[PDB]
Scaffold this active site. Structure first.
Site, short mmCIF file in Angstrom:
data_model
loop_
_atom_site.label_atom_id
_atom_site.label_comp_id
_atom_site.label_asym_id
_atom_site.label_seq_id
_atom_site.Cartn_x
_atom_site.Cartn_y
_atom_site.Cartn_z
N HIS A 1 0.70 -1.06 0.05
CA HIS A 1 0.25 0.20 0.16
C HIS A 1 0.52 1.16 0.57
CE1 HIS A 1 -0.03 -0.29 4.63
NE2 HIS A 1 -0.11 -1.84 3.71
N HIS B 1 5.86 6.77 5.80
CA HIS B 1 5.75 6.53 4.23
C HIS B 1 5.20 7.25 4.28
CE1 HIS B 1 2.87 6.00 7.14
NE2 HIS B 1 1.99 6.57 5.87
N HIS C 1 2.02 8.91 1.00
CA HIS C 1 1.19 8.70 -0.11
C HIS C 1 1.01 10.10 -1.08
CE1 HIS C 1 -1.03 6.96 3.53
NE2 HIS C 1 -0.26 7.40 4.23
N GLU D 1 -3.83 13.05 2.58
CA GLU D 1 -5.04 13.03 2.85
C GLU D 1 -5.46 13.51 3.64
OE1 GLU D 1 -3.15 9.28 5.31
OE2 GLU D 1 -4.03 8.61 3.40
N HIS E 1 4.45 10.58 6.44
CA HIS E 1 3.84 10.37 7.54
C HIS E 1 5.05 10.43 8.06
CE1 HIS E 1 -0.19 10.31 6.31
NE2 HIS E 1 -0.24 11.35 6.46
N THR F 1 -4.62 6.43 8.74
CA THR F 1 -5.48 6.55 7.42
C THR F 1 -5.31 5.29 7.41
OG1 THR F 1 -3.82 7.64 6.99
CG2 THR F 1 -4.94 8.55 7.59
N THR F 2 -4.66 4.38 7.49
CA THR F 2 -4.91 2.86 6.35
C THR F 2 -5.97 2.16 8.12
OG1 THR F 2 -2.75 1.98 7.04
CG2 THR F 2 -3.38 3.03 5.18
#
Ligand SMILES: [Zn+2]
Length: 257
Positions: free
Chosen positions: A61, A91, A93, A103, A116, A195-196
């Site tokens: 992901h 990581h 996004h 996000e 993040h 958020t996951t």
């Protein structure tokens, strides 16, 4: 299983993770006019001089740059936080296009990507125990816009060919996360969630106001990663962001006027 496709994306997560419709979900839109300055917040303390990066992993992901979190080596303190929070991984996004990927949003504006830096509260002993607590994690979020290159990102970009597909890892020692930070530590903060999946409501979010700039070429390399494993149909790892969730009974506080 969950992902970012049409049939498994954010709008589906609630079926397996009902907390997706909870009271303190992340990300959120930051409405800069309604956030309130909170004079009693402290300055943040980001103490990354002794950080020990270990490895980079494509988990299907995102990619995680992992740190040794078995001692207080890279820690976050201050701001809204009580106590000491240890860096475990960072990581990103990011989008398929420069106009989306973050996000959090700022007055509904989407950035090209969001970093993040994930930290856990040492009072809970390990990450897995921390995520079961309302104050278990502190995530430092940093927006990325496309413009000039970020020199301190380049070492990350250049190892991505070695971890193209899900489940691949590579040694990633001696990386200095200080090179990913903007000049200012001005921030907004609020209580939220991962958020996951599993979307646990364990995070104090600290979102920096000042974005970092990365180059087109740098973000383009992110977009060459794959969600799939090796020898499976190629699906580019893009648009791995959850959209803004309802703020509900929360107030976003600002560290700055
Ligand atoms: Zn994240």
């Amino acid at each position: 299983h969950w992902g970012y496709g049409k049939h498994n994306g954010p709008e589906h997560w609630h079926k397996d993770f009902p907390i997706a419709k909870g009271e303190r979900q992340s990300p959120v839109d930051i409405d800069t006019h309604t956030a309130k300055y909170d004079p009693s917040l402290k300055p943040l303390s980001v103490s990354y001089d002794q950080a020990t990066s270990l490895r980079i992993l494509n988990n299907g992901h995102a990619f995680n740059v992992e740190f040794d979190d078995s001692q207080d080596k890279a820690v976050l303190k201050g701001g809204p936080l009580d106590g000491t929070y240890r860096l475990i991984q960072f990581h990103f996004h990011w989008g398929s296009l420069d106009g989306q990927g973050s996000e959090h949003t700022v007055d509904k504006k989407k950035y090209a990507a969001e970093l993040h830096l994930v930290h856990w509260n040492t009072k809970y002993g390990d990450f897995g125990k921390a995520v079961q607590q309302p104050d278990g994690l502190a995530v430092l979020g940093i927006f990325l816009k496309v413009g000039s290159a970020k020199p301190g990102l380049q070492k990350v970009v250049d190892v991505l060919d070695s971890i193209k597909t899900k489940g691949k890892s590579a040694d990633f020692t001696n990386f200095d996360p200080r090179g990913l930070l903007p000049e200012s530590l001005d921030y907004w903060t609020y209580p939220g969630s991962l958020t996951t999946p599993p979307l646990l409501e364990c995070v104090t979010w600290i979102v920096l106001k000042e974005p970092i700039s990365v180059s087109s070429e740098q973000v383009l390399k992110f977009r060459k990663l794959n969600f799939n494993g090796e020898g499976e149909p190629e699906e580019l790892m893009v648009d791995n962001w959850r959209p803004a969730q309802p703020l509900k009974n929360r107030q976003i506080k600002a560290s700055f006027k």
